[PDB]
Amino acid sequence: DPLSETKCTLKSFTVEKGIYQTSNFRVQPTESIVRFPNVTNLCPFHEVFNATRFASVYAWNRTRISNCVADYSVLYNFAPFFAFKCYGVSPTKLNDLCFTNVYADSFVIKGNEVSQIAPGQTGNIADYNYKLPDDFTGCVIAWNSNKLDSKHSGNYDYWYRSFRKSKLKPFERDISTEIYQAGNKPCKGKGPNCYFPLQSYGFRPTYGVGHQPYRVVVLSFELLHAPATVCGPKKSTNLVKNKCVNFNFNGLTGTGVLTKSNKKFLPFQQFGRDIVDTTDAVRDPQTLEILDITPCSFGGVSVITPGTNTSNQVAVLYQGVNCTEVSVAIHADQLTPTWRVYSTGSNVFQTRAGCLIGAEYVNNSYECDIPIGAGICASYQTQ
Amino acid sequence: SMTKTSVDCTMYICGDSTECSNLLLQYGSFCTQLKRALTGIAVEQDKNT
């Protein structure tokens, strides 16, 4: 009850007369609603992960994945995964997020070169073939492909750049065949201080596991909650307004009430931000309507008590709210402090300091005893 | 006098999140100190008037 909370805040079993700021009340959400777009067609993950032929590491294939539903359970169907390293995002959460765009960088490397596919790594493949960005966010999936990328006579179709003047920048692909030059003497062909930058892998089934060909796909996401586009496989829920709800607009997660508004979004605008960079409005992906977001009512809770001596009776001030809002929240049982103080009908009084419950308003005027605020005080009196 | 303000430490730092609240409980009695200071300021403003 409020008095026990007051005792705990004071850390004593006896409470002196006064008004004590005990806690904070919040209005809890009633329903949870998500709003994902009309797109139903699945993303072409099977084509990328089950292609007949894979490009060379120095010519890594960049596949664009956008405007589709990205179900990551399909990726688990063909899962001989040797590495499933997700950086910046938990894999288990990948089905609950909406990604602005997906880039699938697919290539073939050696088994021992898998560890080079990571941010901040160094090596032949990392520096001369494929370099990840320092702030890379996404996942890297590496799986053996010996049964498809090996030949008895030697599969020479896969080549890697072994020599280069400078290390490759992130997301940079080099296909030049200029002979590497060591020193200042120009190279007109094969010879001393001159080597071919590209070397054939020559994958063979008889080779060891560490030398077997491995298909590596780097799924890079741009986790920005504005263009939506590639959302996860979650069922949409009908929109409900004028009620404190947990909303999920294209991965934009929040809590509050949604209301029709006059914020005239331009055709390209998706969501609005306040002066202090707080999300003020959102756009419904399906109905294409503008919705102001107003977080559910919260505030301070103070307990007016006449002291442990006189009585255990208390009054509760919910600071800065309508009394009707508090009454509605109590009726539907949405208030965070669940120790609802009994209200008769004459106990509820609306002050400018907030909603005062448990104190009867008298049309008298005495010297202030317990300062509630805004010219209103309280006292334990015989009435 | 000036404006009397009240700040909820938990709501400001770890708004309606229980993981963040549990992590913030490991920082001691900082939030209680801030609440006490702000309450003292408010009562002092009323006293000034």
């Binding site: 505030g299 800065g320 300062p371 605020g373 010219g375 | 408010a42």
Partner: peptide
């Protein structure tokens, strides 16, 4: 003139307590 900025501040744990003496009471004292 006293002091959307106010709604944004009130929306993350920052509330403003009204003074105990209303401006009418201050005028009465004066």
């Amino acid at each position: 003139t006293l002091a959307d900025l106010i709604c944004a501040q009130k929306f993350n744990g920052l509330t403003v307590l009204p003074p105990l003496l209303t401006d009418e009471m201050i005028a009465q004292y004066t």
